[PDB]
Ligand binder design. Structure first.
Ligand SMILES: N[C@@H](CCC(=O)N[C@@H](CS)C(=O)NCC(=O)O)C(=O)O
Ligand SMILES: N[C@@H](CCC(=O)N[C@@H](CS)C(=O)NCC(=O)O)C(=O)O
Ligand SMILES: Nc1ccc(N2CCc3sccc3C2)nc1
Ligand SMILES: Nc1ccc(N2CCc3sccc3C2)nc1
Ligand SMILES: Nc1ccc(N2CCc3sccc3C2)nc1
Ligand SMILES: Nc1ccc(N2CCc3sccc3C2)nc1
Lengths: 219, 221
């Protein structure tokens, strides 16, 4: 049967999957899991995904509990022969490598910063520390873009979808003034029709964060 | 052109790659990058890998900067038809899913703990907090083993290699006794000839941590 996506659009990895789904016009059933109400700890979802995280994809008997696996799976099933998840091995490995950068480096550091806001209160966060950690991510991405026009090569791939949602989230706080290649790439991503899938969730994330913490991100 | 692996065996993800290299008898040129001396910030390596992390693999013009990419690449190049990185799509996705669990959950939480020891000092670390976080990973892995002998199924896969190295590192601090499936899995992993590639580096990590932090892990003799 058709894929089922457990989601909360405020989640950047969720938005990456939403962008792919829109890009490929994949017919998917959406099941909302409200992270703010802690619905990821509901007995049935916990049983389904012990990591209590979104996105989660159920496709037949297959249960995927990580956005990067979901991106790759959906690409291989609904974009067979496509260039998003390249056929050529070396090209595919480059995309995979960036997907892991997003998971291990960019998202980890953005998560550290955003969780700190929630836990400590906006005014009490060591912003200088997190500015350093996240600017380091900006620097790395700028380096990757000095070689290729997109993150993992000359064409749009799954890596760009994964990275742009988290990047847009980091950019709620930290400006991209000093990173021209990154800004050019980000602007190009925003021109994509699929980028609309990132829009609603990013603003709902901003709304929820700002309401909970009684603060405002810099304009 | 043979693959080149930049490594420090104290690194758990490095050890996962070392294990795979031994399992598949891959001819690789090892290049030691001493993390304790901050050699990952040397100009040439930093230029190669702006993440300044090991393992890093150079294979022709391909530069891989994450152990999970390295594992998959080496399996696809040197173990086509093998069970480590299954051909069947559903099985392959299951392995991939578990590799990402290692990266996003298990290693992240072990990293948080071990880095805290170095940055705060062993005596000052909120051990109760990290014990909760890492016990959660134990529980999850126990669940994954409910229906199979190995992490992603009945056969040893890349997922087992990635997970066991970090697992053994967590086990330096937190015991596995109360997790029957996980304990028997770990014991079985230790029986593999390839597990030797985890032994040397694991002990070196223990020795370095204990020397730097002036402490002893509870598992130490
Ligand atoms: N590496 C995972 C990260 C998943 C993740 O952290 N999801 C967050 C939303 S941004 C979540 O579900 N948090 C709920 C929780 O951890 O309890 C992926 O890419 O899917
Ligand atoms: N997700 C990465 C993690 C790599 C990693 O964190 N390596 C550590 C060794 S355990 C490192 O090189 N640290 C050096 C640094 O960050 O400066 C992978 O699986 O390869
Ligand atoms: N990773 C992640 C992303 C989003 C969320 N949300 C939306 C914003 C907030 S502020 C307090 C709780 C929540 C639930 N949680 C975790
Ligand atoms: N308890 C708790 C509640 C929310 C969070 N967040 C805030 C929103 C985002 S955006 C990317 C990561 C996160 C993590 N962390 C921990
Ligand atoms: N991830 C990671 C793994 C190992 C290392 N090492 C070996 C142990 C220690 S204790 C202080 C520095 C180092 C260098 N660093 C970072
Ligand atoms: N500055 C610094 C030096 C070492 C570390 N470590 C210690 C060894 C290990 S084993 C898994 C993760 C880590 C991280 N972190 C930060």
């Amino acid at each position: 049967p058709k894929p089922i996506l457990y989601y909360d659009e405020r989640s950047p990895p969720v938005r990456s999957c939403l962008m792919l789904i829109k890009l490929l016009d994949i017919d998917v059933e959406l099941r909302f899991v409200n992270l703010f109400k802690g619905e990821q700890f509901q007995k049935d979802f916990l049983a389904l995904n012990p990591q209590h995280s979104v996105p989660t994809l159920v496709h037949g008997d297959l249960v995927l509990t990580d956005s990067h696996a979901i991106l790759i799976h959906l690409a291989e099933k609904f974009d067979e022969g496509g260039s998003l998840w390249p056929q050529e091995h070396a090209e595919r490995m480059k995309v995979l490598n960036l997907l892991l950068f997003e998971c291990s480096f960019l998202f980890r550091r953005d998560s550290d910063f955003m969780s700190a806001i929630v836990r400590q209160g906006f005014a009490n966060v060591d912003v200088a520390h997190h500015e350093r950690k996240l600017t380091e991510a900006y620097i790395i991405m700028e380096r990757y873009l000095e070689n290729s026009d997109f993150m993992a090569g000359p064409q749009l791939t799954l890596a760009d979808l994964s990275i742009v949602t988290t990047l847009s989230t980091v950019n709620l706080m930290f400006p991209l003034s000093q990173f021209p290649r990154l800004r050019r790439w980000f602007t190009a991503m925003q021109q994509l029709d699929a980028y609309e899938a990132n829009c609603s969730g990013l603003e709902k994330l901003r709304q929820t964060m700002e309401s909970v913490g009684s603060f405002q991100f810099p304009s």
